[PDB]
Amino acid sequence: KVSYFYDEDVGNYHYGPQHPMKPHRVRMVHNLVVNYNLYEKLNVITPVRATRNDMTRCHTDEYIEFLWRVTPDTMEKFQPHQLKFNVGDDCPVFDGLYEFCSISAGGSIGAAQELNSGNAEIAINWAGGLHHAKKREASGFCYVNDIALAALELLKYHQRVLYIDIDVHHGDGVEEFFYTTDRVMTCSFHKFGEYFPGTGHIKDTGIGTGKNYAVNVPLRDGIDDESYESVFKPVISHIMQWFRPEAVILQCGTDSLAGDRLGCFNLSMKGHSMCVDFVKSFNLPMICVGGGGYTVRNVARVWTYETGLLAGEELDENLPYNDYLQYYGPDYKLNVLSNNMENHNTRQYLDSITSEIIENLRN
Amino acid sequence: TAPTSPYAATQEELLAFTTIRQHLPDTLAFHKFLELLHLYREKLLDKTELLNSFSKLVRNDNLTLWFSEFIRWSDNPILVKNEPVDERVYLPETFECISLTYRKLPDSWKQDKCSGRDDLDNSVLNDDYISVAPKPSHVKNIMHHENQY
Amino acid sequence: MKQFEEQIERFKQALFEDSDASDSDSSIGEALTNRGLKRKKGSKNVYYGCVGNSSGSSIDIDYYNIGNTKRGVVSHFRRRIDPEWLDHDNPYNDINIAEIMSPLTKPQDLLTHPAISSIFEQNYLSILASSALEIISAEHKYTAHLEQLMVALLGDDPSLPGPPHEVFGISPEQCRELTITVQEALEKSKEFIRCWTNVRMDLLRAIRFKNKVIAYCQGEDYNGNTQV
Amino acid sequence: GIEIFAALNDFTDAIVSVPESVCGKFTSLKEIDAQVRDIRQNVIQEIGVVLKNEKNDELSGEERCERLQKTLKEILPYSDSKICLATDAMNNIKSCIDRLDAGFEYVELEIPQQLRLGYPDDRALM
Amino acid sequence: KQRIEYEAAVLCELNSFAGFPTAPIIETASFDDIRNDLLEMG
Amino acid sequence: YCRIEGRDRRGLSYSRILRDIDDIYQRQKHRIDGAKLGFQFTQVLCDSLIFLNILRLSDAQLTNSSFYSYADKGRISAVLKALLSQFFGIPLLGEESKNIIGYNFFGNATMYVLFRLICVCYSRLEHIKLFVESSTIYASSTGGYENILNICEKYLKGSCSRLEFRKYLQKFNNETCYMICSIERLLKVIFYRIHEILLDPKLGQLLLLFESDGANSVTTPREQMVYRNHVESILAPESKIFNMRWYPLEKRLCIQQLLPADLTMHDFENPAKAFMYYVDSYAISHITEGVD
Ligand SMILES: [K+]
Ligand SMILES: [K+]
Ligand SMILES: [Zn+2]
Secondary structure (H helix, E strand, O other): OEEEEOOHHHHHOOOOOOOOOOOHHHHHHHHHHHHOOOOOOEEEEOOOOOOHHHHOOOOOHHHHHHHHHOOOOOOOOOOOOHHHHOOOOOOOOOOOHHHHHHHHHHHHHHHHHHHHOOOOOEEEEOOOOOOOOOOOOOEOOEOOOHHHHHHHHHOOOOOOEEEEEOOOOOOHHHHHHOOOOOOEEEEEEEEOOOOOOOOOOOOOOOOHHHOOOEEEEEEOOOOOHHHHHHHHHHHHHHHHHHOOOOEEEEEOOOOOEOOOOOOOOOEOHHHHHHHHHHHHOOOOOEEEEOOOOOOHHHHHHHHHHHHHHHHOOOOOOEOOOOOOHHHHOOOOEOOOOOOOOOOOOOHHHHHHHHHHHHHHOOO | OOOEOOOOOOHHHHHHHHHHHHHOOOHHHHHHHHHHHHHHHOOOOOHHHHHHHHHHHHOOHHHHHHHHHHOOOOOOOOOOOOOOOOHHHOHHHHOOEOOOOEEOOOOOOOOOOOOOOOOOHHHHOOOOOEEOOOOOOOOOOOOOOOOOO | OHHHHHHHHHHHHHHHOOOOOOOOOOOOOOOOOOOOOOOOOOHHHOOOOOOOOOOOOOOOEOOEEEOOEEEOOEOOOOOOOOOOOOHHHOOOOOOOHHHHOOOOOOHHHHHOOHHHHHHOOOOOHHHHHHHHHHHHHHHHHHHHHHHHHHHHHHOOOOOOOOOHHHHOOOOOOHHHHHHHHHHHHHHHHHHHHHHHHHHHHHHHHHHHHHHHHHHHOOOOOOOOOOOO | OOOOOHHHHHHHHHHHHHHHHHHHHHHHHHHHHHOOHHHHHHHHHHHHHHHHOOOOOOOOOOHHHHHHHHHHHHHHHHHHHHHHHHHHHHHHHHHHHHHHHHHHHHHOOOOOHHHOOOOOOOOOOO | OHHHHHHHHHHHHHHHHOOEOOOOOOOOOOHHHHHHHHHHHO | OHHHHHHHHHHOOHHHHHHHHHHHHHHHHOOOOOOOOOOOEEEEOOOOHHHHHHHHHHHHHHOOOOOOOHHHHHHHHHHHHHHHHHHHOOOOOOOOHHHHOOEEEEEOHHHHHHHHHHHHHHHHHHHHHHHHHHOOOOOOOOOHHHHHHHHHHHHHOOOOOHHHHHHHHHHHOOHHHHOOOOHHHHHHHHHHHHHHHHHOOOHHHHHHHHHHOOOOOOOOHHHHHHHHHHHHHHOOOOOOEEEEEEEOOOOEEEEEEEOOOOOOOOOOOOHHHHHHHHHHHHHHOOOOOOOO
16 A cells, blocks of 8 residues: 556656766666566556646746746757756756656655545655755756655644655755754765765754754765664664654665765665665655666666565565566676775764764754 | 778878979978978967968969868957856855855845745745855865776 | 878868867866866866766767768777786777677577577567466456356347346346447457467467577487577 | 578577567556456456346346446446557567568578488487 | 678777777768658658 | 776876976975975885895796797896896995995986886885784785785786686785785886887987996096986987986985986085085086076
8 A cells, every 4th residue: 555656758758968867767667666566566646747836835936937938949048047047067958847847746746645645654756856956946967856845745734754865965955945944854864075065064953943953964985784774773763762753755865875876885775775674664654755876777676676665575586577677687686786895984983973963862 | 991080081182282292392391381280280370370371382372272271261350258157156155154054145035936835834944044065176186986897 | 101191180180179178188087176177078067066977088989980880989998008008907808799790600509609699598488478378368257257248138148038138127228238338348358369369379489480490400419408 | 502591690680579579568568457457356246246146136236237337437448558559569579570480481491401300310210 | 691791890890990889879861861751741 | 906906007107107206396496385406206125135026026927928029028137137236236434435325327207207116016015015924814824925926926927817816815805915916017017118218229328327337436526417418418408317316325215307407416515515516517517507
């Protein structure tokens, strides 16, 4: 009884010639869900495209209308206004942009509406969860920030929401959206240093009445499954003890795996799925969205595993013959491994940051 | 068979250039011609000056015209305009800081409206603080991506 | 005159050169900015916000025109004979193109040739044929029941001699609507089966031919099994 | 003279071409087939109760058939999808298999006898 | 077979000399064929 | 393996080496941060057997290369042996004057690159030996460092392949011991430099000149200056000079880069000595040393 949103069109969009972000990856996921016969254990839905009045509760109407009117072949009149909204270089303009944004935001708002009305406990929208887009400009491959809309929907019934983020990059759009409120708490586990977006410092914990209600866990290179677990379980446990969330939005970016295009971590499929296990084990209403992920064979396999494990099933190790099978050679297994990349987190460092966090959380 | 490199010399142009050297009565004139070409390559020899010296070495009008056609010469008033970039692409870093990265907003930027906001979202969402990431200046030890497999 | 041709080509390349370019051999690493380090082989892709730089200066492509078609090429791993580069620095080392793309010329080579043998070891037909049977069977379990109801409604049922509307009391104007919809359903369900059966039988024809060839090109090594 | 194996070299390309068309179509089917199974089991139970008329006797025969009618009306748009997909797959595989068959007709000719009938002494023939 | 045999030689030569060849390029139709098609559609 | 090997190969590029030394020299000449002139590279070479180890590895690899014909192997082995023994002085109240006179070598970019490579190879071998000995796990064996040497010897002749090599290396679990594989690369670059010198017809006199200056007792300036003028003349009018000085007392190698009007000896203990050396230079040196 897991709501699983999926629109068939989202896999036909195309960012640009050699761009790293391919929505096609989502389609690959579905193509393994069907051939793994998980189609029958899931309540599969088709998202209602979000209107324009739905998308301008976070964003501004000027930015959303610009997104509406623009077009890749009639942007000789928009070319001046392009970079006023950060559009153009790594957030390009492509054919059918507004459709893609409406698809993803509609999936997220639909999941929130499923959870509001008791129709399920766990919802899945693998083609949403774009956490970088800001209120008045695109930012780092994301144009509209659907997660803020999902949370604004959840807050109608529930009273306190928790947004957990395990994308290697920082979730800056979401954190900046709810930075001065206590009703939503953001928690991010991100590589820090000389890295995108360069925010996310361990002393940035909200303002106003939001003081203490954010959590930034600045890690370093090469981190692996055991260290990640050792710093993930204590903080999550104390947040659930002291914050007492009612709804959980879990962001499942997969550029934190070993071998990614733009990643510097060393997790593996087991190390990544441990987080989903541990957050599920609290028996809460849980939306579970996608995120980063730029080596698409890894993304497909890991997201398939996490869906089969969120439902409650036990998928085989081998891979069922499907259309995108040859992407997964030469082994053809549902496993993503890790490499001998050298860790850079000394145990003393992890314990220091963990203690500083937990001492912050006691208020 | 043999592969054609990108922008490889075509046969017509090689023929024409060897006839140019042949009209040049000397191997010293041919060497001077190579010197002209090289000095144009090394950003010490202009375009029109290359054409002028080429003509004063070839003393033939049709070859001057063929060169000016190969050089892709065009005399037009080069127009240079300087347009500043929009205020919003750099203005953030003049805002009164609050923390390392969060900077208070000025009143002129809290003057645009989102039209789908009800009474809830006007009390949950953050309105007046931005997140201005920090800017490197002169990085001087750049890391690469080394795994080539 | 080869040196002269090289000179002419070099001059043509200089004319061809773009208005803005990268001259320094060192490329821009991650580096997350272009200030200071412009003219750095890829610094046009970098600025303030710059998620990253995905295109490194090792996959860059150079086009060479052969005959009538242009073929790109990865030219960072050329022979480029030098002291610094070892052979095992080349990813595409020991990938022999001349023997991967080569023809057979000998029937038994079917079982040793690298690429071809990797082709006769896939069992994608035997999976698809069984999937087709699994799909046909459920549909047929449904069609059999539709068909029984049909022979009842028409009236050609040996065990039901009376009028069908009577044997399950309904107005004779309800029986006609029911019969119409049942007829549509039964006809469509029969057509789907008739097509999927042709699909499956042709898959089986392919499987039969494949095994026959695997058994021919084994000569005296023919032990009944033909799983490569 | 000496013979290249042109047919035996095209056979190996046809044998690869065959699965892909139907691969796409098979998956597109499994989706539809899996979003219709509950309705089909409904229909089977309904036909059974209407045709036995003596084993599950809790109904009013006028309504016991209005339910079957509505259920049959529900399943109708899926049969059209299945028919379109089956005809597409049929055409694709037909062309591919015509090619493969025309090839195998020849690959059996330019292959030495001893390679398909064995040596004239490895035949029992009592 | 002749076409494959020609392509193999071309690619082995291009391999030794220049680099390692990537996938065949996906190009448009010819100028002549575009012309004829715009004609018969016109 | 990939980070180490990539950073390595990206480090020892000819032009990169030259640009590094040039940048340091330019920063000195103008006193940008208060840095005054002098030496731009300094390093101590203690052991004398490590050089024989390096010679062993070099000959091992040289018998298994495929660029050079049968005689170039002998040529290159000889040249390496000669430049090792002569310069580095490795055996292959009236006596301290030697250890007080630093021996001088003048060459061009090729020589500077060659010597930078040799110092790098030495440093890495020595760090290896120190880590095998001081670390109390593999030191417990009689010849763990020696086992490493014998294994590398095996591999470089073609008697062992690279997979066994790398998996055996993984036993040490050490980046410091990851650094052993780079020796093949370093040796390849070295052989290349040496060969391009053996074809450099201006080499002979140069190294011959070196031989000549390996016979004096303690030099007066004028001899060194006329040596330097010889060298500077043998090259084209455009070139730089690289000065490599050997202190056998401290067993220290120092390297600097000299342009036309530069001082060869930077330290004078009294103004009279300075004036003496100047006048000598004005006499002989092609361009007066020490003038702006
Ligand atoms: K908050
Ligand atoms: K994060
Ligand atoms: Zn990310």
